[PDB]
Design a protein around this ligand. Sequence first.
Ligand SMILES: Nc1ncnc2c1ncn2[C@@H]1O[C@H](COP(=O)(O)OP(=O)(O)O)[C@@H](O)[C@H]1O
Ligand SMILES: O=C(CO)[C@@H](O)[C@H](O)CO
Length: 497
Amino acid sequence: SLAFYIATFDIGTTEVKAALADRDGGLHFQRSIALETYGDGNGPVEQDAGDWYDAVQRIASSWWQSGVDARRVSAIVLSGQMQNFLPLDQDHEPLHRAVLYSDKRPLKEAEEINARHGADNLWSALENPMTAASILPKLVFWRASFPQAFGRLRHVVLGAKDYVVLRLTGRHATDRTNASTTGLYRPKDDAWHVELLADYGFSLDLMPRLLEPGEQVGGVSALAARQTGFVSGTPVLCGLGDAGAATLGVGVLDDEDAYLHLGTTGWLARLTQTDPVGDMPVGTIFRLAGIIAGKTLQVAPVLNAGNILQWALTLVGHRPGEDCAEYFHMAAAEVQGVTVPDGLLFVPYLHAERCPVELPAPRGALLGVTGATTRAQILLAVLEGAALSLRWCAELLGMEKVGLLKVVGGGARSEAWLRMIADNLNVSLLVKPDAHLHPLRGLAALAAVELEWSHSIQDFLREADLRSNILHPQPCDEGRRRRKFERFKQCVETLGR
Ligand SMILES: Nc1ncnc2c1ncn2[C@@H]1O[C@H](COP(=O)(O)OP(=O)(O)O)[C@@H](O)[C@H]1O
Ligand SMILES: O=C(CO)[C@@H](O)[C@H](O)CO
């Protein structure tokens, strides 16, 4: 017998990652191609969509020339960046650089849309934020500055991997997980928000077809086979946005499962049964459809996360050009055995924030300093403050019944921060290493089911796992931790003046 594979790709924000997955959950022939982002942090956040497909071509070529027979690739499936704005013409050629999720230039457009339609009406329909980063504000902003290119508009691509799927198959599709993020999809109707699009003069023909992640979009076309070396006719599945694929990949499959991404920025998520949406949150919350039938992933994006720990290295002597490794080591060593006084509190909003509070300007402060305060207490207070912000997100997400948080990202290298999170959220934590592979694992599992390699995603993932210790919360004076948390919320409000 010879090995057969699922080709998995993640068209990420900074690189395209890929692997050939076997039925036992192994990820072979791993590849990474870096992507360039344009805008220099000055407002635009943009990429050339052709670079995404160029990466896929380079990857596939590297597989065939490493001895892989493309006929043994039984399916291709992708995840990638969500909440993109990429306008294409009738030849599927870009009319502008793809605009990434973190670009929030269209503030006035979002304000106008919320005013015209009613912020509460939109939240009820979309179950997801309508902000400057949303796709309708970006499409209106683009039409206004580029009317000639707008006249050539035929397709609006909403997620990076959907552009690659279009190049491979000739068909425009997207998954409902990504669709949720855009502010254009109505989860309870399972349809694009027709009357919102029509009000702004946009035809539904611009939008991709909604497909389930395991559904086949089409086979690789003859042209795409010439361009990539994949066998024409190989099934290309729709796949799903990277948040969905990554959470699946670590086994976030059941009600009250939960996930925390601790990168430079991060996000906290709770999977739960789909329910009617409540009142508009103060604090941004996404409700992502489509990852698991009958369930919704509630997500709180956090713009102050690992970057807070990185900032704090200044206190141990880090300077702008220097390598950080030794300073992280020092900071970790300095907080061992230390306790934060109840009165010392660090409000960690060094950058604008979305959750748990909408803050367009920083609100960073160290409060309660006395002559007894030590630098070590301050460094630990910084981790505590970051954890208290996460506790507030957890409250907004309704995470009282969550038993275990799966944790990923470079922030999890801080053992002291993990202790602060477990104790303050009163939740057990399991760190899942090698985060760049998690979406590929999720994609492999969902494709394995469609190929009849496995009966379910759960079966596939558990077998792959047969190839670590949970961190549990310390008993606390619950009341005492709660009171500090309530003080934290009071201080955040008061600092707003
Ligand atoms: N040795 C370390 N100890 C603790 N945290 C670290 C260490 N090295 C890096 N980090 C944290 O990891 C974060 C980056 O995580 P990562 O998953 O790479 O996110 P991103 O891709 O968003 O930069 C940084 O904000 C930094 O604070
Ligand atoms: O586009 C989205 C919606 O969640 C992202 O901003 C999230 O932070 C990760 O899921």
